[PDB]
Design a protein that fits this description.
The PDB classes it as sugar binding protein. Eight copies of one chain form a homooctamer. By secondary structure, chain A is mainly beta. Chain A has two helices and 14 strands. In chain A, β9 (139-146) and β10 form a beta hairpin. The structure holds 2-hydroxy-3,5-dinitrobenzoic acid (4 copies).
Chain lengths: 209, 207, 207, 209, 207, 209, 209, 207
Amino acid sequence: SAAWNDVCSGTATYTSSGYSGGALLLDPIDPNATITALNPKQLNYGGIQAALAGAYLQVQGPRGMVTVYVTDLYPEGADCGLDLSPNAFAAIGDTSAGRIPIRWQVVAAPVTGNVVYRIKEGSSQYWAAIQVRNHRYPVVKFEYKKNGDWVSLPKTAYNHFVGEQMGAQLLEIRLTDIRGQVVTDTLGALPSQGDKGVYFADGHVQFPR
Amino acid sequence: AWNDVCSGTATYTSSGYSGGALLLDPIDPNATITALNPKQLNYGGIQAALAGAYLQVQGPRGMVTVYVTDLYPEGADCGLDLSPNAFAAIGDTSAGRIPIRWQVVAAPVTGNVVYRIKEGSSQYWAAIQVRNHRYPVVKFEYKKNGDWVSLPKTAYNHFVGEQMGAQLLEIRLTDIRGQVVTDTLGALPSQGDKGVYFADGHVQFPR
Amino acid sequence: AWNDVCSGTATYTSSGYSGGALLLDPIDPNATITALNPKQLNYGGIQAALAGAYLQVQGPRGMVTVYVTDLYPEGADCGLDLSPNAFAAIGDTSAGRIPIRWQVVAAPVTGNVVYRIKEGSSQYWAAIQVRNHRYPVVKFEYKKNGDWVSLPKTAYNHFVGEQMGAQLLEIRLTDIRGQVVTDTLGALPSQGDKGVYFADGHVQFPR
Amino acid sequence: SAAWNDVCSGTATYTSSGYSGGALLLDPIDPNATITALNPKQLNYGGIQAALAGAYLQVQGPRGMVTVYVTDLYPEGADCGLDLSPNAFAAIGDTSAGRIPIRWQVVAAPVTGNVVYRIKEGSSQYWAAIQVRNHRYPVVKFEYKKNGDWVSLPKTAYNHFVGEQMGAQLLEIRLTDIRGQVVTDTLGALPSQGDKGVYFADGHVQFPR
Amino acid sequence: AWNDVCSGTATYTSSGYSGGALLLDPIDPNATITALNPKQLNYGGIQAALAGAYLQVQGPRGMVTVYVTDLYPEGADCGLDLSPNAFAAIGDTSAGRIPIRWQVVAAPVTGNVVYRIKEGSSQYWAAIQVRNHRYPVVKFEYKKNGDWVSLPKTAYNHFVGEQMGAQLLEIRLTDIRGQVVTDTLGALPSQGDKGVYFADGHVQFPR
Amino acid sequence: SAAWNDVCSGTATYTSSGYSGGALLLDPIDPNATITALNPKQLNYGGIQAALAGAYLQVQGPRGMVTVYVTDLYPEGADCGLDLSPNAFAAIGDTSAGRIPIRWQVVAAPVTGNVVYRIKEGSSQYWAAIQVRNHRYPVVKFEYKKNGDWVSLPKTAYNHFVGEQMGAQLLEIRLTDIRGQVVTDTLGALPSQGDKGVYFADGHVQFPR
Amino acid sequence: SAAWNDVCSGTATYTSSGYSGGALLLDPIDPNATITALNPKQLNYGGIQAALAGAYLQVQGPRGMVTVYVTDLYPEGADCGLDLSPNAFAAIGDTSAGRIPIRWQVVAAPVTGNVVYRIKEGSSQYWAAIQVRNHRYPVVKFEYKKNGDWVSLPKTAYNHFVGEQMGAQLLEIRLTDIRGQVVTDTLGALPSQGDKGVYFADGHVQFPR
Amino acid sequence: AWNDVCSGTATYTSSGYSGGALLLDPIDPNATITALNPKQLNYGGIQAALAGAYLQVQGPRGMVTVYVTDLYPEGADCGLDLSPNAFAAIGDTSAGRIPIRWQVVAAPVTGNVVYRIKEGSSQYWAAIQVRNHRYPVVKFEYKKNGDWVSLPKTAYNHFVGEQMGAQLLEIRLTDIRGQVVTDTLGALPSQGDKGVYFADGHVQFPR
Ligand SMILES: O=C(O)c1cc([N+](=O)[O-])cc([N+](=O)[O-])c1O
Ligand SMILES: O=C(O)c1cc([N+](=O)[O-])cc([N+](=O)[O-])c1O
Ligand SMILES: O=C(O)c1cc([N+](=O)[O-])cc([N+](=O)[O-])c1O
Ligand SMILES: O=C(O)c1cc([N+](=O)[O-])cc([N+](=O)[O-])c1O
């Protein structure tokens, strides 16, 4: 009954985009997964770009309920609007209704194991973009330790947190989910120059239940 | 006269929980909120002076505390445009308009102030909002080569500063009581193409 | 995904046996090899993700399995630039371009993985290549102070890490199926003035 | 007869704060100790943050004298002002006066044994915060040896000395107290990454009487 | 004209021992000190040129040496604003104003100069003060990327430099006689959030 | 025999001013030096204010010859007129004549070492005034490098070159003397705000002989 | 076929200039090489200054065909005009004619190896000019990476690409030739101040055949 | 066009054996040396490109080979400023100015190249001169994180690099003929507070 889990009422359409090349850089998507694009107003919760990227939403339509994984931006979607994948749309409605009424809310993701960090290509001690994947709840704040004090990083529309002059040593980092739960983790040192491509690092924590 | 008791009238409206002018979103759906008329909101010529204040509003049937999130444009002196839950606690909702006597009180905050950095903020142009403050914030200063540079507060409840630079910032806050606290804030982006982000402060105005 | 069939076309060239971008020399002259288009080779954004994979390629006239040793730069989606012997087994070389389907398969390896240490590698900066792997390697980790550091993979099919140290390395490899093995590797040179050298691993990705 | 032991004329208040969580990170404090918070002008003597942290001050009030241990900052305290603890206040004045006139000076601490080093959590060869504790006189200068030369470290308001790129080897340090008395010592190597908590190392020297 | 005999008048004040403009605290309560008129203090347009000088002042009753710790703002040419102990040494205190002849002389220093790094100093902006110097310092250079750089002296008796870096620096001092010495100085903070700290130098101006 | 070293015929007076507080801001002056004030027509050669500031003029009178350092403007001076120091006057003529006939020309100065830069109080990356001192020959053009190209700065009556928007980086500068000889130098970055006093920098070049 | 390889019909003269001091700063030039100056209209193709600088042009004349290297601007040249070196002119026409009809097109350069970077004197992290040399085809776009996105730099009449505030770290750069072919490369840090002369770096790519 | 015959004139001077701008001291007092005009010294816009070259110089009376130690700043095209012993060997000395024809030639070196590390060099900023080279050195590279980085040559005949680090360096040298040699060079000082020092190379440009 809080702000983060408030129930949205809107309409859904269906689309086959979002399994590949979504704006949120969450590939690879299981081709059998039920997914959705999210309208700007909710995706950018509180003005935080991509705040609900990778969230799981429970969606109720006229005739069923499904859980979907936010992988794309839905650029022209109205308030509370979803652009559902076809299997998710069919599980809650009739494809020949074109557009259906929906109600939805953020819910806990079916994650096992800890969060996963994706370091964007070209990241370095000078400029880096760090994405958090496999999180039980949407991630709204990313902090790291520098000279003994925490430094908050902004989230981008491509669902990474960007930081400048982060240095080239072991990063002590701190994450906050949309409920305000805080976890702390460590991450290996960034590349010294930005001549590298994507790589993934396992994290050592997971937001609680 | 910050502690002065206002006398006026209250209407109600279901706006303010989102998209209000003071950019205080997200508002707790449980919160009792209000829009504030221009004369008290822009106290002393300073835009959004009372933004994020807590007003103790006494009405016919009771007394409630509300959270200023919006401007009440056509509101008269001492006028409030309350949320439905706050209006119903202090008056009969049948009325549509009720007499009220209110005064600024201390927000029941836990923890320290929070800094909200507006999208597009940079070393060249930045807007910084202070939320979670015990009392309303009327002066925002940062330290440049030894002096405190005072920044104008805007109608959208951020302080705006130009050419603030890309280093660690030392800031000074003054609330409507004249209480002063000093804090640090991480460096702003070197270019202004980022969205909103939040950072915890390390101080709170005293009781 | 990564295991599904690919549909595309194959050209052919005599490059790749020597000096391919994936630094997999020495190549057996009897080998059937291919260069791989950028989209599939750099799967998931990971440079040279499919380096050293085996592709089962079906063509008009037959089926052949090939070893990814190079990048087909102008290559199109699902494009392969095949070696002649492999092109001629699955189609008419007279045609210059042929329709193909292909997918990743287990390599016909015997024995463990092999490590190749790039010239100039050292405790301060090192580049380490895994070859003779049953499936493609997408993640290379090493234990520092008791925790696993992930190293980025480069376009020249090595994993590059800084400040790795001059101690015995515990490492951990993840293939594209998500299978994990754990291995040891002798200490890196104290300074980066050494050439290429090779060391055998003690593990192979499960069948 | 010198600047360091000049006599301050001021006024005192009392407070029950400072036995725990004081700004100078001097816990644990004996609950029966006579302690004080110190106004910023004398606490930050010569502009050195926390210069008089851990000092002992002899305080003369209207009815007696008492020795207090400086554990916190009196943020709004006026010139020469002290925020005493209630036992120190009753030792020298009547609580019902609220505010009492005092005169105080720095005096020798009743220490037994050598100085003690406290290493802040998150210290490393890259960035480190080292506190000096159990010192006979206030410590105003912290130097360590690097490549043949001494290197001076600034003191902070949380009563630690802070250094960058200090290295992960055994440390030769040099301390100056507020009288100009000099001792030198060794400190075990700092952790190589900033992933450890607080710990305490015994020193081997003490400033003379 | 550095050893030139100045003829003026002296008054007395009890400021100077703390909070003087030249930031020379802490002052030995036993010291005889003076504030210096702007004409001789800001010699040649160089702010605080004679800061920390020792002036040998002759009066009607006797002669005393004073330590320049402050600016005598309304001071006249050759004017001094003495401390009560130095005025009493050389005049009848009941007289409020005495005629004086003085000149700069060598300070009775012991050991080498001392560097006082101002709060806020960093690789981006630093103020460095030289004290315990036999003669007044009028030029501060440091070596940057292989070249010497002259730093302006300020009214608060520090030399100021920007973008100086966060590494050991070679420096070069020139006293008012033209005597040059060279020294080293430790790394400035990488962030400008520290207080004052002191570092010993390794040279003194010759006799 | 060119335009810059053309022989001037005029009259000299003598004055005791210009050893201190001259308009060309060249203090300190050796009180033993032989100095002069220069009439506006030759001081502002080419219309370049202070073109001949700090020149050395060789001056022949009825009785001798002397070399003088131009330290001030002779405001009421007529064509080719000088207002000499008394020791320069007495070296070439009788002070009781009051006014003497002279013939003079610019000559190389007895510089030792390289040129010297004086930065005027209030200079900054936005507005700056830079004086060239200790030059073998008068300086008629001051250029600095911005964005790949030289930028000529006008000279003022107070013997500095003034530039707007010079920026706060290392300055590459180019100097021309009245003979057309060019030299190239470097100068440390200007203050970022005009809040500093005078200060001097050594140059690394001198005009050739 | 396309606009980049359209056949120009024009006239050619001969000049002995262009082997050194040409406006496009391509020295050193082999003295046996067949070179040309190129009229403004095709040299500044699409308005891009020096677009065809360092192009190779196949020139058919009345008498034969030759390939030429574009080293200079032909200021007064008409539409499709070339100012040929004497060996090139004599290879395709008779010199006594003084002016010959020519047809020509951009062709691939006899390039051995990868491209070559020439960094102009005075370049730095604040202002830098970078010339591409030894390119198989004319180079019409130059981009480098800053804060994670590409920044396009304008070409100059002196055949360098110029950028401001490029910084002093490793440069990831992207080159586009006149056919639209894109290669990616890296380049070492620019100097921190603009006090350096010309230096050269080899690239690691070439435009495809 | 670099080894072409230059036709110009020579003067003579007693400078260049000490304090020459190419920092080639100590110069053998028996050596025949020359200052070189800016046009040929700075070939291709590379500062000091021909520093330490040997020029065979033909004049009216004979021939001599000279060692380029200095910049001849006023020198005209192909201009040389010879030392007295070199001028006297090829000209009448009373002439003051003589016609000359000259070309770069191989230096009669013995042994490998020598490296000279400028005072103040460090891992942060370093200046490295190459001495004892058969032909002029026009490009200097060092390996950093696996790749070559080119350093600009300066008017004082050193290559300057920033952030080169404090570890063993792999370096690559290119002479003006296009010949390439590879070498190693001991770690630079971790702080720039040292004087000049020399280290032997292990390679020499081919004949
Ligand atoms: O600190 C945060 O991460 C934070 C995040 C949001 N948010 O994600 O909407 C809002 C507030 N806030 O204070 O209203 C925050 O403090
Ligand atoms: O084990 C080796 O000694 C070894 C040697 C070479 N080699 O000498 O080229 C190549 C490989 N390899 O696995 O390609 C090796 O394993
Ligand atoms: O060396 C120091 O630690 C030091 C400390 C102070 N201080 O704590 O006021 C003053 C000076 N000083 O030179 O005036 C110092 O040299
Ligand atoms: O290697 C050396 O120790 C050495 C020393 C000097 N030096 O002591 O003047 C000069 C050269 N040199 O090559 O000109 C050297 O090689």
